[PDB]
RNA sequence: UGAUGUAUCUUGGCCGACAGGCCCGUUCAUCGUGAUGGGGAUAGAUCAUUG
C-alpha cells in the first residue's frame, strides 16, 4: 500500500498492566488511567509534549512511551520517603504516585497491616465492619451480607 | 561427579536448550487464545495450542479444547528473546528462581518488551518465560536410539547457570 | 408498558442493556476509511438532495454518525463550499448544501 | 468608527468582548507566572496547560471589564465571582476555588504596567491608561455584533 | 538506631498532662516490668518509651497495651482500648 | 429539563492548592446518550482548623 500519515491503526495498551482503554481524547482518556483526575491529566500531556485532542490510542510510539514513563515518574515533580529509616511498617512513603496496581497491591499491605498491629482499624477488618464511620441506622448491606431473612 | 579438574571447557560450557514462553489462563476469560497475538509479537514466531489431559474440579470439563498457548524457541531467536526479556525483570536478583538443575524462569505481561500494545489486542499478566540451559552433550538424553540419562557429571548446576548467564548482560 | 422484575433482600431488578456501539469515532475520523470520501459523500452528500436543509443532529441520527464525527466532516465540506451551515447554541443548527 | 466603540466598551456581550480583548493583551511584556500555578489551582480539569488562550488572558481581560463600572473593587471581589463554594448536599461538591493566590497574581502585573492603583481601603481604581486600552478595543467589537 | 528531637503527626503536640508523664521514665531506669494502669488517653506517643509494658483502662478490666516494634506514630487509645468496645458486637 | 469548563462579623491588600496565617484598620471548547467525560459510595495516605 501507499504510506499515508498514520497507517489505519488503532491501539492496545497494557500501560500499567493488563489495561486497554480508547475512543477518548488523550486528556480525558488518561483520567481513566489507573493514575489520573481531570486535574492531573492536562498536566501530564503538555509536560510530555502531547496535545489535548489527540486520542491516546491514535498516537505514535514514542509519544506513548513518554506517557508510560512520565505518569509513574517525571521533571519538576518527584515523591520519595525519607525521614530517618526508623519506623518499621507502614508509613506513606510520600504519596505513591505511582497510583494503580501498585496502589491496589499496597492497599492490601495496608489492610493487612492494621490487623497484626492490633489497632482499632485492623480490628475492624477482621470483623468486616466498615472502618471510617457510617450511619448505621440503616445501610451497610454490602458491608457484611445481603438482607438476611429476619434475624432471631 | 563434576570432573572439572583437568584442562576443561568448550564442551563443558553451557548453552541454551530452549526458551519456552507459555501462557496459562484459559478461554472465555480473556478469549480464544488472543494472547497468542501478544506471544506472536514478543517472540517472533507463532504459538501452538495447549490442550489439557487429566483432572480439573473447577470449570474445565471440555478436555480437548483450547486453553493455553506456548512458543518453544531456541537458536538466535531464543537469545534475541533473552536480551529483551533479560533486561525487564530488574536484576539482581536472585538464586531462588534458579533450580539446582540449572534452569531459571520468570513472569511478567507480554506487554513488557519493546512492543507495540497497539498491535496486541490483549496483553495478559503472567506466565513463565522459562530458560532451559544445558551442556552440548544433551543430545544423548534427547535423541531417539541410545537414550541415556544425563549423568550428575553432565548436569548443569545453579552455580554454573548463574555464572554463565551472569556473564552476559544483566 | 412494563418495567422489570422486583428486588431481592439486597437488591433490585433492572432488565435492559442495549443495542451497541460502534462509530467509536475520532479514531475512524483520523484513518482514511470514514474520513476520505465516503462519509462525506454518502452520508452528507447523498442525504442533502432529498431534503435541501437538515439539522445536524437529525443528520446525526439518521446517518448514525457521531455528532463530533460529522461535525468535522461538515466543516471540511463547508470549506469546500459544498455545504453551508447556520448557527445555534446547542451546537445544533442547520445544514444545507446549496441555496437553490 | 468611534460611536460603536466607546459605549461598547461598557454594554457588549462579553464573550466577544473577552475574546476580542485577550489577543490585544498578548502583546504585553509581562505574564511572569513564577511557577505558582502548577500545584492545583482551579476548579477540577483546570490546571493551567490550557491557559495560554483559555485562562490567563480571559482572566486578565476579566478583571478589566469589571473594574471600570464596579470600582472600587478588591481581591475578595475577584476571588468569589466565578466561584461556587456552595454549602454541599454532602454527596456533592461542586468544585473548589482558591483564590487569594489567583487574584493576587493578575493584579501585580497590571500595576507594573500602570493600569491599576490601590486606595488605602477602597481597593484598586482605574487609571486613565486602563480606560484607554479597554475602551479603544470595545471599539472593534460592536461592529462585529451588528 | 539513631534519634534526636522533633517528630511528625497532624496538629497534636504542646502542653499535656504530667501525672502519666512523671510515671513513664521510672520503668526505664528500674527496667521493663509490670503494666501501667492508665486511663489517660491524650498522651501522644514519643520514641523514648519504646518496647515497654503499658496498660490502659478502656474501662473495667485492664487491657494490656504494648508499645511494640511496630507501635508508635499512632495515637495511644487505638491499640487495645477500643478493640474491646468493638470486639463485643463482633462476638 | 444533563455533564464540565469558561464567560454572565467581615474586609484592604503581600503570601498560599483546599484548609489558613497576618498589617493596617444562558455563552461556548468539551459531552456522543457512553453503567461512562454518569454516579459519588467505600476504603487507605495525609494537611489545617474548631477543641
DSSP B16-66: EEEEEEEEE--TTTT-SSTHHHHHHHHHSS--EEE---S--SSS---SSS-
Distance CA(E34)–CA(E55), nearest Å, equals: 9
- The residues on C that touch A, with CB distances below 8 Å, are 8-11, 24-27, 30-33
> How far, rounded to the nearest angstrom, does the alpha carbon of residue B161 sit from its chain's CA centroid?
14
Q: Of the candidates D71, D41, D64, D55, which has an alpha carbon nearest to the alpha carbon of residue D113?
A: D64
Mark yes or no for CB contact A42/D35 under 8 Å.
no
Cell numbers given for D68: 471600570
B129 class by beta-carbon count within 10 Å (0-12 exposed, 13-18 middle, 19+ buried): buried
Mapped to the 3 state alphabet, what secondary structure does C58-92 carry? HHHHHHCCCHHHHHHHHHHHHHHCCCEECCCCCCC
Q: In angstroms, rounded to a whole number, what is the distance separating the alpha carbons of residues C89 and C73?
A: 19
Burial C78-89 (b: 16+ CB within 10 A, else e): eeeebbebeeee
Listed residue (D76, D23, D78, D81) closest to D52, CA to CA: D23
- In this complex, the residue of D35, D46, D50 whose CB is nearest that of residue A39 is D46
Q: Is D142:D12 a contact under the CB 8 Å cutoff?
A: yes
Of C27, C31, C33, the CB nearest to A23: C27
Cβ–Cβ of D45/A38 closer than 8 Å?
yes
Dist. CA B156–CA B150, nearest whole Å = 10
Count H helices, E strands: chain B?
Answer: 4, 5
Q: What is the DSSP string of D32-68?
A: --TTTGGG--SSSS-SSSTHHHHTHHHHHHHHHHHHH
H or E stretch at D18 = helix D14-25
CB of E2 within 8 Å of any CB in chain A? yes
D76: which 3 cell numbers? 475578595
**Residue B23 Cα to chain centre, angstroms:** 11
CB atoms within 10 A of CB B100: 11
For residues A15-33, one letter each, b for 16 or more C-beta atoms within 10 angstroms of the residue's C-beta and e for the rest, the string is bbbbbbbbbbbbbbbbbeb
Residues B147/B140, Cβ–Cβ less than 8 Å: yes
| Contacts made by residues D70-76, CB under 8 angstroms, sequence distance 24+ | D71/D123, D71/D124, D71/D125, D71/D126, D72/D119, D72/D122, D72/D123, D72/D124, D72/D125, D73/D123, D73/D124, D74/D122, D74/D123, D74/D124, D75/D100, D75/D103, D75/D104, D75/D107, D75/D123
Residues E24 and E67: their CA atoms lie apart, in Å, by 12
Question: Residue D122, Cβ neighbours under 10 Å: how many?
Answer: 11
**Whole-number Å distance between alpha carbons of B91 and B110:** 18
SS3 (DSSP) at D93: coil
Termini Cα distance of chain A: 75
Q: Are C56 and C13 in contact (CB under 8 A)?
A: no
| CA atoms lying within 13 Å on the CB side of residue B71 | 24
B145, B151, B154, C85 from B148: Cα distances, Å = 9, 9, 12, 84
Cell numbers 488523550 correspond to: A26
Residues of D in contact with A39 (CB under 8 A): 40, 44-47
Q: For residue B147, what is its C-alpha cell? A: 537414550
Selection from B52, B114, B38, B47 nearest residue B83 by Cα: B114
Q: How far apart, in whole angstroms, are the C-alpha atoms of residue A118 and residue E74?
A: 12
The answer to whether B39 and B110 are in contact (CB under 8 A) is yes
In sequence order, the 6+-apart residues with CB closer than 8 A to the CB of E87 are A123, A127
Chain-centre distance of CA B120, in angstroms?
21
Breaks (C-N over 2.5 A) in chain C follow: none
b (16+ CB within 10 A) / e for C41-72: eebbbebbeeeeebebeebbeebebbeebbeb
DSSP letters of chain E? Answer: ----S----SS--S---SHHHHHTTHHHHT-S-S------------GGGTT---EEESSSSEEE----SS--SS-GGGTTSSHHHHHTT--
- Which residues lie below 8 Å from residue C81, measured CB to CB, with a gap of 6+? none
Beta-carbon contacts of B51 under 8 Å, excluding residues fewer than 6 positions away, are B63, B64, B65, B66, B67
Is-contact D146 D4, C-beta < 8 A?
yes
Query: What distance lies between CA D37 and its chain's CA centroid?
Result: 16
Q: What is the DSSP string of C8-24?
A: -TT--------S-----
The residue length of chain C stands at 100
DSSP sequence for A118-145: T-HHHHHHHHT--SS----SS--HHHH-
Question: Which of D141, D112, D115 has its CA nearest to residue D29?
Answer: D112
Decide: D54 and D23 in contact? Cβ < 8 Å.
no
Residues in chain A closer than 8 A to B112 (CB atoms): 14
- Using CA atoms, how far apart are residues C83 and A123, in angstroms rounded to an integer? 69
DSSP single-letter state for residue D121: T
Give the contacts of B53 (CB within 8 A, at least 6 positions apart): B63
Task: Please provide the size of chain B in residues.
Answer: 170
Q: Which helix (H) or strand (E) holds B104?
A: strand B104-106
Total residues belonging to chain E: 91
Distance (Å, whole) CA C78 – CA C65: 18
Q: HSE on the CB side for C41, CA within 13 Å? A: 4
Strand partners, C85: C95
Among the listed residues B128, B85, B86, the one whose alpha carbon sits nearest the alpha carbon of residue B107: B128
Cα–Cα distance measured from residue B126 to residue B107, given in angstroms and rounded to the nearest whole number: 5
Could you tell me which of B97, B94, B93 has the C-alpha nearest to residue B133? B97
Counting CB pairs under 8 A, whether chains D and A reach 3 or more, is yes
Q: C41: which DSSP letter?
A: I
Residues 6+ apart with CB under 8 A from E35: E53, E54, E55, E62, E64, E65
Residue B24 and residue B127 in contact, taking contact as beta carbons nearer than 8 Å: yes
Element (H or E) spanning D72, and its range? none
Residue A133: all three cell numbers together: 464511620
Whether D119 and D72 have beta carbons less than 8 Å apart is answered as yes
Residue B98 to residue B131: CA distance in whole angstroms:
10
Residues B101/B134, Cβ–Cβ less than 8 Å: no
Query: Using CA atoms, how far apart are residues C70 and C26, in angstroms rounded to an integer?
Result: 10
What is the Cα–Cα distance from C74 to A80, expressed in whole angstroms? 51
Q: Which residue has the cell 481601603?
A: D121
Three cell numbers written together for D103: 487574584
Report the interhelical angle of B35-43 vs B75-87 (nearest 10°).
100
Q: Which cell numbers in the block locate residue A56?
A: 491516546
Give phi and psi for E15, each to the nearest 5.
-35, 135
CB contact under 8 A, A14 and B121: no
- Does C touch A (3+ CB pairs < 8 Å)? yes
**Distance from the B132 Cα atom to the nearest Cα atom in chain A, whole angstroms:** 27
In angstroms, the CA A141 to CA A128 distance is 12
Which technique was the structure solved with, according to the deposited record?
cryo-EM
The CB density around residue C75, as the number of other CB atoms within 10 Å, is 12
Q: Do A146 and C30 touch (CB under 8 A)?
A: no
- Interatomic CA distance for residues A151 and A80, integer angstroms: 51
Find where cell 468486616 sits. Answer: A128
Q: Cβ–Cβ of E86/A120 closer than 8 Å?
A: yes
Closest alpha carbon to B120 in D77, A16, D17, A11: A11
- A14 and B111 within 8 Å at the Cβ level: the answer is yes
Residues from chain A contacting residue E3 (CB–CB below 8 Å): 84, 86
Whole-Å CA distances, D89 to A136, A139, D1, D92, D93: 19, 18, 52, 6, 8
Chain D contact for A38 (CB, 8 A cutoff)? yes
Question: What are D66's three cell numbers?
Answer: 469589571
Among A25, A26, A28, A39, most D C-beta atoms within 10 A, so best to mutate, is A39
Decide the pairing of beta strands E62-64 and E55-57.
Answer: antiparallel
Nearest protein residue to nucleotide F47, judged by CA and C1' positions: E10
Q: How far is CA A62 from CA A69, B116, C27, in A?
A: 11, 10, 18
* Short-list D63, D93, D68, CA closest to D80: D63
Q: Which of A11, A18, A61 sits opposite B124 (nearest CB)?
A: A18
- Tell me the pairing of strands B68-73 and E62-64: unpaired
Amino acid at each position: 500500500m501507499s504510506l499515508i500519515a498514520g497507517e489505519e491503526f488503532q491501539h492496545i495498551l497494557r500501560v500499567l498492566n493488563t489495561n486497554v482503554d480508547g475512543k477518548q481524547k488523550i486528556m480525558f482518556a488518561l483520567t481513566s488511567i489507573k493514575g489520573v483526575g481531570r486535574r492531573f491529566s492536562n498536566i501530564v500531556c503538555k509536560k510530555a509534549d502531547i496535545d489535548m485532542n489527540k486520542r491516546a490510542g491514535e498516537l505514535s510510539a514514542e509519544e506513548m512511551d513518554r506517557l508510560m514513563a512520565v505518569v509513574h515518574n517525571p521533571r519538576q515533580f518527584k515523591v520519595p520517603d525519607w525521614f530517618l529509616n526508623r519506623k518499621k511498617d507502614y508509613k506513606d512513603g510520600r504519596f505513591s504516585q505511582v497510583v494503580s496496581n501498585a496502589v491496589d497491591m499496597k492497599l492490601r499491605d495496608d489492610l493487612e497491616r492494621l490487623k497484626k498491629i492490633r489497632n482499632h482499624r485492623g480490628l475492624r477488618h477482621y470483623w468486616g465492619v466498615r472502618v471510617r464511620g457510617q450511619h448505621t441506622k440503616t445501610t451497610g448491606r454490602r458491608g457484611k451480607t445481603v438482607g438476611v431473612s429476619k434475624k432471631r | 561427579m563434576s570432573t572439572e579438574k583437568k584442562q576443561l571447557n568448550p564442551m563443558r560450557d553451557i548453552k541454551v536448550q530452549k526458551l519456552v514462553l507459555n501462557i496459562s489462563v484459559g478461554e472465555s476469560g480473556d478469549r480464544l487464545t488472543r494472547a497468542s497475538k501478544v506471544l506472536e509479537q514478543l517472540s517472533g514466531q507463532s504459538p501452538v495450542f495447549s490442550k489439557a489431559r487429566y483432572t480439573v474440579r473447577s470449570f474445565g470439563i471440555r478436555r480437548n479444547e483450547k486453553i493455553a498457548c506456548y512458543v518453544t524457541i531456541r537458536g538466535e531467536k531464543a537469545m534475541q528473546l533473552l536480551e529483551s526479556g533479560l533486561k525487564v525483570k530488574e536484576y539482581e536478583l536472585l538464586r531462588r528462581n534458579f533450580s539446582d538443575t540449572g534452569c531459571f524462569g520468570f513472569g511478567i505481561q507480554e506487554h513488557i518488551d519493546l512492543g507495540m500494545k497497539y498491535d496486541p489486542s490483549t496483553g495478559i499478566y503472567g506466565m513463565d518465560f522459562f530458560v532451559v540451559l544445558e551442556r552440548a552433550g544433551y543430545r544423548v538424553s534427547r535423541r531417539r536410539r541410545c537414550k541415556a540419562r544425563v549423568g550428575i557429571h553432565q548436569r548443569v548446576t545453579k552455580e554454573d547457570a548463574m555464572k554463565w548467564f551472569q556473564v552476559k548482560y544483566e | 408498558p412494563p418495567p422489570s422484575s422486583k428486588p431481592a433482600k439486597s437488591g433490585g431488578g433492572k432488565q435492559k442493556k442495549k443495542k451497541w456501539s460502534k462509530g467509536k469515532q475520532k479514531e475512524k475520523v483520523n484513518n482514511s476509511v470514514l474520513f476520505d470520501k465516503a462519509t462525506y459523500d454518502k452520508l452528507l452528500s447523498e442525504v442533502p438532495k432529498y431534503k435541501q436543509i437538515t439539522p445536524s443532529v437529525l443528520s446525526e441520527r439518521l446517518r448514525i454518525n457521531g455528532s463530533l464525527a460529522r461535525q468535522a466532516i461538515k466543516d471540511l465540506e463547508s470549506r469546500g463550499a459544498i455545504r453551508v451551515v447556520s448557527v445555534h447554541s446547542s451546537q445544533l443548527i442547520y445544514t444545507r448544501a446549496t441555496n437553490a | 468608527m468611534a460611536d460603536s466603540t466607546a459605549r461598547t466598551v461598557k454594554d457588549v456581550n462579553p464573550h466577544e468582548f473577552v475574546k476580542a480583548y485577550s489577543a490585544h493583551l498578548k502583546r504585553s511584556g509581562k505574564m511572569e507566572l513564577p511557577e505558582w500555578v502548577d500545584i492545583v489551582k482551579t476548579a477540577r480539569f483546570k490546571e493551567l496547560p490550557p491557559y495560554d488562550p483559555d485562562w490567563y488572558y480571559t482572566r486578565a481581560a476579566s478583571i478589566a471589564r469589571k473594574i471600570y463600572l464596579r470600582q472600587g473593587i478588591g481581591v475578595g471581589g475577584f476571588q468569589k465571582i466565578y466561584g461556587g463554594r456552595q454549602r454541599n448536599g454532602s454527596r456533592p461538591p461542586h468544585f473548589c476555588k482558591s483564590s487569594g493566590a489567583i487574584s493576587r497574581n493578575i493584579l501585580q502585573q497590571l500595576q507594573k504596567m500602570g493600569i491599576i492603583d490601590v486606595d488605602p481601603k477602597g481597593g484598586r481604581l482605574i487609571t486613565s491608561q486602563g480606560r484607554r486600552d479597554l475602551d479603544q478595543v470595545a471599539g472593534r467589537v460592536d461592529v462585529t455584533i451588528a | 538506631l539513631k534519634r534526636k528531637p522533633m517528630a511528625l503527626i497532624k496538629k497534636l503536640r504542646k502542653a499535656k498532662k504530667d501525672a502519666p508523664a512523671g510515671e513513664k521514665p521510672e520503668p526505664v531506669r528500674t527496667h521493663l516490668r509490670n503494666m501501667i494502669i492508665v486511663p489517660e488517653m491524650i498522651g501522644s506517643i514519643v520514641g523514648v518509651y519504646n518496647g515497654k509494658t503499658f496498660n490502659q483502662v478502656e474501662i473495667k478490666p485492664e487491657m494490656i497495651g504494648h508499645y511494640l516494634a511496630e507501635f508508635s506514630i499512632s495515637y495511644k487509645p487505638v491499640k487495645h482500648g477500643r478493640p474491646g468496645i468493638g470486639a463485643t458486637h463482633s462476638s
